[PDB]
Amino acid sequence: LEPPPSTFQPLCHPLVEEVSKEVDGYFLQHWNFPNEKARKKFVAAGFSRVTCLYFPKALDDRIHFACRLLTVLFLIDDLLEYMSFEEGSAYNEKLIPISRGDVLPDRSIPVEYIIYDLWESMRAHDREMADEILEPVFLFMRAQTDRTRARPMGLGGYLEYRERDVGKELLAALMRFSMGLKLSPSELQRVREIDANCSKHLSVVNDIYSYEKELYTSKTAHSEGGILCTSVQILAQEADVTAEAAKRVLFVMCREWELRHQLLVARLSAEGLETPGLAAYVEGLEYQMSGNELWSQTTLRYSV
Amino acid sequence: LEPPPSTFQPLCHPLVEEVSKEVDGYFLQHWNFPNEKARKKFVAAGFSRVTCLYFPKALDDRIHFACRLLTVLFLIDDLLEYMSFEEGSAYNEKLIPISRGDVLPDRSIPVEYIIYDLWESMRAHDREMADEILEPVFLFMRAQTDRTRARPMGLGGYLEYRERDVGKELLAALMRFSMGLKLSPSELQRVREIDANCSKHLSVVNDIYSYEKELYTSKTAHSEGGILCTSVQILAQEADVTAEAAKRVLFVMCREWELRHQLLVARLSAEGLETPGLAAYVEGLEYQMSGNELWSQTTLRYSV
Ligand SMILES: C=C(C)[C@H]1CC[C@@]2(C)CCC[NH+]=C2C1
Ligand SMILES: C=C(C)[C@H]1CC[C@@]2(C)CCC[NH+]=C2C1
Ligand SMILES: [Mg+2]
Ligand SMILES: [Mg+2]
Ligand SMILES: [Mg+2]
Ligand SMILES: [Mg+2]
Ligand SMILES: [Mg+2]
Ligand SMILES: [Mg+2]
């Protein structure tokens, strides 16, 4: 699959090597893997590497928080594929009061105390910004087991749903936390169209590279949890082409979304609405798009 | 607008110029054009040229029949844009028993006697092959004023409707008539998938090039008859991109349909199911797709 030309230059956080070893090492000690093969596959995924590609301008003392969060969510994301929608919902809902810190974790259950200790440490570093990630994460978690996954969706309906299932808002709040980048409610409101456009890029780029993984999952995992829910399958179905043909077409659309990102950013500046914070923000969103693509093209999670 | 590479090479019927003058001349003599500007625009469209590009291997004494049919359908196609769905339906339904030869035409009304004389002349030349064009034409006519045009559609839903509105079936029966290519019901059943694939190509290629014409029509003509119903609008709405962005993506999809055409034809041959008639037929479909693109690229109908 040859990617069409992009003007975006992907950037990686300079501390990616040490943070990856730190965070991978943490999960290897605490997380319950089924076997040595799974432990190797975990490291092979490079979960801290995505994070460092998503937020390359995160503060040096905050990047590890982001790596820990995306890592545990990735691990949960895989676990949910072997559960029903009901079981998956129960699993996630239990982690929500724990994430808030309102309920103590069962220290014998790794996922419970990993989540608790993480959010506690994040609030310890920056309480105000850590709290602003809470609701976006919960929105993402509840989307993962949404019944709409078991209903037919057009491309438009899917992308609207997938903004939550891909965790667009959490990525936004996580990015701001990691950068210590604060925005007023007025600034946040102004870039909503830019956010929605970015979400489609992230979602479809992931759909493109994770298709083989998710096709296999749909044939082997739970009938509900492993369900095939992706723009690749939808376009292939609607246009009556192969999945690989759908990928090539979708990749072209992703480049159009990149063009639209630049247009919207230019218009924000052409109008009076550009601020230093917003400039850093929309630039950060570009890194998410290019970083997500670079990681997707190289991670063993999708190629194996 | 840069067309992505294609391996389909267009062919034109050798007698295109002489038949154009004959068919253009007939309509200029009989059809009720409002003024000289409309008569010039009519000639500028090249309705016989597209027909000769659609069926370049039509028999020398049958190509004019195809040119007449497509020309009169094109003329009605524009007429319908100033009518409501109701008026458009009543207009078309009147012509249907006339086309069958069951109802005599009003000789003071050009469209009625032109359509009557056409079908009578076609039945005289080849009774059986002419009759097999009737219902496909009627299916197309009724799709033109279908109220599904004014209702929400996804890409898949549009394409399945478009197959009727683009007259894929009538074109196939017209091609067979023009070439004297007779196929058994079983043979035709073998290439159903190939027909469906070809329909999408013809539809979207037309949508891409005729968008500006149809955008203008939607803003100037009847809100119903001139309604903007096209893949360019649908995809742009689904993916939240501009029409120009949608065009570029759709053009890539068109090339995927070309690849699929070659795949399906290759499979048909390998299974020992490609009869000499079927070989001529599927080649004929390729001429339709390539011929449609060449004409769309150059006709003044879409450029002015
Ligand atoms: C952890 C997840 C599965 C969510 C957050 C990260 C992100 C965007 C990385 C790419 C794959 N999907 C997701 C969703
Ligand atoms: C006459 C028509 C409007 C129908 C038949 C010819 C064909 C495919 C040529 C291209 C434009 N539209 C059509 C539809
Ligand atoms: Mg997943
Ligand atoms: Mg998921
Ligand atoms: Mg995926
Ligand atoms: Mg038209
Ligand atoms: Mg039409
Ligand atoms: Mg058109």
UniProtKB/Swiss-Prot annotation, chains A, B:
Requisite cofactors: Mg(2+)
Keyword annotations: Lyase, Magnesium, Metal-binding
Keyword field contains Magnesium: yes
PANTHER family, A to Z: BETA-PINACENE SYNTHASE-RELATED, TERPENE SYNTHASE
Cofactor note: Binds 3 Mg(2+) ions per monomer.
Protein name: Aristolochene synthase
CDD domains named among the record's database cross-references: Terpene_cyclase_nonplant_C1
Quaternary data: Homodimer.
Residues the record lists as binding Mg(2+) 2: D77
Record: residues binding (2E,6E)-farnesyl diphosphate: R301, Y302
Binding site for Mg(2+) 3: N206, S210, E214
Catalytic activity: (2E,6E)-farnesyl diphosphate = (+)-aristolochene + diphosphate
GO molecular function: aristolochene synthase activity; metal ion binding
A Gene Ontology BP annotation from the UniProt entry: isoprenoid biosynthetic process
Pathway(s): Sesquiterpene biosynthesis; aristolochene biosynthesis; aristolochene from farnesyl diphosphate: step 1/1
Stored InterPro entries: Isoprenoid_synthase_dom_sf, Terpene_cyclase-like_2
Family: Belongs to the terpene synthase family.
Database matches in Gene3D superfamilies: Farnesyl Diphosphate Synthase
Keyword ATP-binding tagged: no
